[PDB]
């Protein structure tokens with residue numbers, strides 16, 4: 063229990079705000095004792111900001127930070143993620159002594175308040191390149207020093223992937239090789255692509271999942287959900303449909319807890 | 326150092342024996358001072374065993390160990406890997422105090438004799454589920470105790486993925502959470518699939534790669550290579566073709582170094 067520690071998320075538009083809302087709802091569901099904070103930029107509508115105020119203890123307006131790095135973003139095939147540099151504002155939140163940042167496309171499945179036992183920078187390994195941490199869930203300490211060092215590095219050097227993850231890994235470059243206690247178990251940031259890629263591991267370990275992360279171009283809010291049967295329409299090879307359980311949980315929380323505030 | 330330490334690989338047939346030949350040639354190219362050993366099973370042809378003896382210091386004949394676990398292997402979509410339990414015989418090699426096991430579908434790009442500074446069990450994270458280690462490159466200590474404990478666990482419990490990686494992860498279950506010194510840098514076991522999945526990380530870190538691992542169903546020896554133009558034919562969506570230079574290097578070593586020994 064601590065009023066000086068928070069979960070922090072980010073939304074730059076009304077689309078990811080549906081994500082932020084479901085995440086915040088899920089953190090209340092599993093009885094967090096910490097504060098809930100969302101960083102929002104001007105493109106979030108006034109009405110949505112009001113809705114965010116019903117779920118989050120603080121809605122904090124910040125300016126968009128955009129890498130403009132079309133070259134590296136294309137290398138990822140995620141041309142829209144330049145605005146993820148806006149995440150660096152999470153370090154300015156000095157009213158808190160420790161925070162957990164969580165992407166707006168994450169969903170909590172159990173209480174995760176034990177993450178506040180960890181020190182900056184604690185994060186889980188990225189399934190793409192596991193000597194990099196995934197920047198969707200991380201434990202950090204707000205700091206005027208670190209905030210400004212991060213903004214400066216972003217201005218001068220940018221990010222190797224055009225978004226927040228590259229520059230955060232570059233700044234926190236010791237992560238792969240020092241202190242194992244700063245490696246969060248993969249169940250605190252379980253990307254649906256690891257479910258597709260090594261299903262045997264998911265079958266043996268996935269019952270312990272604490273956070274699922276709907277990493278990649280297609281987000282839960284882009285699906286067509288039917289509330290009657292509790293199914294989504296799916297195309298092609300969709301790693302989210304290996305264990306569609308998590309996507310359906312996202313939609314059930316959205317439909318019951320969030321949608322009524324929206325329409 | 327020279328005499329009581331080895332690199333150890335495995336081949337159960339003449340197909341993977343081509344990979345072992347390239348692997349061994351590559352370890353010689355980079356001037357290892359350790360022994361080179363290959364485990365082989367009766368399906369390997371007599372003529373192919375003779376060729377292996379011209380590259381490896383010793384060819385050690387072992388019995389195939391097969392999980393027969395079609396249900397778990399099907400989850401991976403690798404119905405053929407039950408015979409990978411044969412890898413457990415690497416622990417019987419008590420003529421050596423320390424070994425580095427390397428999958429026959431690996432390729433060495435620089436001297437990696439510094440792996441012998443590591444202690445059992447040291448291995449790189451698996452890109453699919455990075456709280457499991459990839460069993461394609463690992464540092465271990467031959468032991469009659471450990472060998473027999475592994476065979477017993479295999480016989481009574483089997484493997485969660487029907488192959489060696491599940492059982493080795495279960496047996497060495499502390500790897501994810503203890504001693505960061507047992508986490509080998511991902512450059513000592515670089516899956517071609519990580520190049521496709523987070524290409525921006527490969528562009529910044531990939532030049533330091535020491536080992537490449539052609540993990541997955543399609544192996545280098547399944548491609549049609551043209552030696553005249555130094556090209557392969559390939560089909561749509563092939564992670565080996567993101568950075569095809571590793572595949573072409575495999576084929577160049579095979580064509581130049583191994584093909585003459587098969588005469």
Ligand SMILES: O=c1ccn([C@@H]2O[C@H](COP(=O)(O)OP(=O)(O)O)[C@@H](O)[C@H]2O)c(=O)[nH]1
Nearest residue numbers: 072073074075078146165166167198277278
């Ligand atoms: O247009 C955008 C893109 C990203 N985000 C925020 O930045 C995070 C990171 O982007 P995303 O999850 O899409 O990246 P991925 O996890 O798929 O690589 C999101 O979860 C949001 O919190 C946002 O607010 N608006």
Ligand SMILES: O=c1ccn([C@@H]2O[C@H](COP(=O)(O)OP(=O)(O)O)[C@@H](O)[C@H]2O)c(=O)[nH]1
Nearest residue numbers: 335336337338341409428429430461540541
């Ligand atoms: O039919 C087989 C399959 C596997 N292997 C050996 O077991 C290892 C593991 O198999 P593989 O690399 O195909 O698994 P992956 O790395 O693709 O998951 C190979 O590199 C070989 O050394 C073998 O000798 N014969």
Ligand SMILES: OC[C@H]1OC[C@H](O)[C@@H](O)[C@@H]1O
Nearest residue numbers: 146197198225226227228
């Ligand atoms: O940097 C690009 C992206 O890399 C992966 C992380 O999940 C995400 O939060 C970040 O925005």
Ligand SMILES: OC[C@H]1OC[C@H](O)[C@@H](O)[C@@H]1O
Nearest residue numbers: 409460461488489490491
């Ligand atoms: O267990 C399945 C497979 O996973 C990848 C490992 O490199 C391989 O050796 C093993 O056979």
Ligand SMILES: [Mn+2]
Nearest residue numbers: 165167198277
């Ligand atoms: Mn995300």
Ligand SMILES: [Mn+2]
Nearest residue numbers: 428430461540
């Ligand atoms: Mn392999």
